[PDB]
């Protein structure tokens, strides 16, 4: 269980202003809606000796607080203690279908969720893996805290084509091929965030949403007494096409 390695205090310690009036959530993002989803997901926060499953749940954490994320310079405790504070995407006019899958009349695939989901055939990929109907009910990535949740652990445990899962990159268990090694893709913080949003954050040097990430990761290991590891950023990694 998932619930060993985090209670309901450390979820509340580490997205400490996620029910604050001032972000959209008002109670959405809930320790039970993240431990309901988190079981329905083998191995999540449950693989390796204690120490890794409680970088795996950092690590989901530091991402998702990224793409949720109301923090800024000046915020009140940094802008790493806002994570978890936004739902939806602000901008809601495009509406993310993309020509080979479906787009149901009056239906928008704009970011949801933790992990933002965007497009029409993302929506259709999560909602197969998890058995909902998402083509036709995009909103309940915005409404079902559970679903909500699942379809961002859904991202995380699952490998597409050239990318290993986010979930053996950070358990050790992905072996990266010569064709990474030559990408300078060293396992580590920095290859998650390259898998997430590699095409923009990475390989152009500095990257500032990219040290968002880490900021958050950095919090969170610091809060559950982690030391941080090597390859954080991804500066010099070409993005997933290697």
């Known amino acids: 269980d998932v619930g060993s390695v985090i209670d309901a205090s450390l979820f509340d310690q580490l997205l400490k202003h996620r029910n604050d009036p ?22 999540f926060g449950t693989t390796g000796d204690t120490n890794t499953r409680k970088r795996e749940v950092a690590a989901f954490l530091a991402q998702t607080s ?33 020509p080979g899958t479906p787009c149901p009349a009056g ?15 993302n929506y259709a990929q999560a909602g197969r893996a998890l058995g909902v109907d998402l083509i036709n009910n995009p909103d309940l990535v915005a409404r079902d805290a559970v679903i909500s949740f699942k379809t961002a652990i859904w991202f995380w445990m699952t490998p597409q084509g050239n990318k290993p899962s986010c979930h053996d990159v950070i358990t050790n268990r992905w072996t990266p091929s010569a064709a ?4 300078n893709r060293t396992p580590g913080f920095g290859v998650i965030t390259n898998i997430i949003n590699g095409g923009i954050e990475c390989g152009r040097g500095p990257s500032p949403a990219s040290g968002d990430r880490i900021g958050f990761y950095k919090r969170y290991c610091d809060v559950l007494h982690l030391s941080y590891g090597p390859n954080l950023n991804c500066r010099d990694q070409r993005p997933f096409g290697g």
Request: net charge neutral.
């Open 22 to 43: 001032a972000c959209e959530g008002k109670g959405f993002y809930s320790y039970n809606a993240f431990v309901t989803a988190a079981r329905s997901f083998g191995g």
């Open 66 to 98: 990224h793409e949720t994320t109301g923090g800024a310079a000046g915020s009140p405790d940094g802008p790493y203690a806002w994570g978890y504070c936004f739902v939806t995407e602000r901008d809601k006019s495009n509406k993310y279908c993309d």
């Open 107 to 121: 239906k928008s695939y704009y970011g949801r969720g933790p992990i933002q989901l965007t497009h029409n055939y």
């Open 180 to 183: 990474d090694v030559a990408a």
